[PDB]
Design a protein around this ligand. Sequence first.
Ligand SMILES: Nc1ccn([C@@H]2O[C@H](COP(=O)(O)OP(=O)(O)OP(=O)(O)O)[C@@H](O)[C@H]2O)c(=O)n1
Ligand SMILES: [Mn+2]
Ligand SMILES: [Mn+2]
Ligand SMILES: [Mn+2]
Ligand code: NA
Length: 461
Amino acid sequence: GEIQWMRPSKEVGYPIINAPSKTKLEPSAFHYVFEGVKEPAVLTKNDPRLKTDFEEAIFSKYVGNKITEVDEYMKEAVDHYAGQLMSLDINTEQMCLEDAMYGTDGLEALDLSTSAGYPYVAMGKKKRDILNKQTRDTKEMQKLLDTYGINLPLVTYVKDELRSKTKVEQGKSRLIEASSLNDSVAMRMAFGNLYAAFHKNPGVITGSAVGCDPDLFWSKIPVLMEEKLFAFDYTGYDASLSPAWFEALKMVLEKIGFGDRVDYIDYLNHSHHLYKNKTYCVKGGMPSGCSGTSIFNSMINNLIIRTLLLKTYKGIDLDHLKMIAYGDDVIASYPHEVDASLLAQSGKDYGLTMTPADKSATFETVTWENVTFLKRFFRADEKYPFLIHPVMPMKEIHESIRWTKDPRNTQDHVRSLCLLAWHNGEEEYNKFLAKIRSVPIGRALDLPEYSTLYDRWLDSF
Ligand SMILES: Nc1ccn([C@@H]2O[C@H](COP(=O)(O)OP(=O)(O)OP(=O)(O)O)[C@@H](O)[C@H]2O)c(=O)n1
Ligand SMILES: [Mn+2]
Ligand SMILES: [Mn+2]
Ligand SMILES: [Mn+2]
Ligand code: NA
């Protein structure tokens, strides 16, 4: 990922983009009943908390493009991955404009809360103005596509969320690169069935966990993995991807019946962006707000791990590489132990910055006791060990509950934290409910007791 040029959007006919300068995150009824150190992320250049330029920080994520061509190892990675995906008989057809808009099995309907993106964002028209769940009317959309045409600029917003103090002082806020409703609809028609096949098959065949339900999936993972587990996290995964990784991706798409629209992958790779009043062009890097961002990142991840393994352990048997990825996050395994640190080294050569799984000091053996996937641990249930508990640390939950964006969604927000928390055991869960009910707001919420949740879980399989 690298920015080729950036300049005043007026110099090229683009309207300045308005983005609220004030966070929507305010302390919640539970702010002083729980401990937390995170605060809202810097949204503007003026934030008094800053200790460096906001611009130099939000964009520094584009470390550059380390590789130029797709080498032999990547090519082999491609062939093998494309091989597995082949056993899914992925319907290679296109998706009728309707389904792409209002869903179908394996794919949800478009989200009405996310930006409509350019031009609509600068014209004033929202997503409710075009779509309409009731009739599934293609017309308004179908018309708008012809008017403004696909492959449209991405609107860049700073993400309004909680972040550690350091990441606040160093201006390490995160950006949201939003695609026009058009682009998003085009892609969902182009790759719609691909998405559906992935959503319906989380596991080691797709090597993706997208669309998964942790309460059920965690019990299916251990069985899918090989004897030895290995893991690591990337730093700036999305923005570090070089153009070559997108080409490898197109090669996979080509091999499974999508050579047709591999062009779309080109816009993810070489993209046009609008942030505030400035405009820039980015070579490489996966944008965050596109249709498929999540899935395409997982496919590339499947290519990366394969590549690093082929270049570090000539003769490794990829047929016994059992991995599952969710964008940058990944959990993998092999019949034999491997050196994650060594793999990390090869990673740099491919433009990836890999470090010990879970901010550890150094690479240490990965076990079922210490491995995490999506911030969650794996813990077999006391009474029935064949059922695995996806365990989200309480700290994460404590951090989330101390803040709010809308008092109206307090019920749903806390209920959600409850569905994550109870896996930490009945004792912990009850303390959590107790503190919640130690203030007026909490006592008025309808929260499920432990027994109710644990029983529902047991019968869900
Ligand atoms: N709108 C956004 C922006 C970024 N990201 C994700 O957040 C990552 C960066 O977040 P942070 O966790 O803040 O950077 P990391 O380098 O991943 O953190 P660490 O150095 O601790 O590994 C990106 O690579 C991307 O996967 C996201 O999900 N949505
Ligand atoms: Mn990370
Ligand atoms: Mn981080
Ligand atoms: Mn991560
Ligand atoms: Na890009």
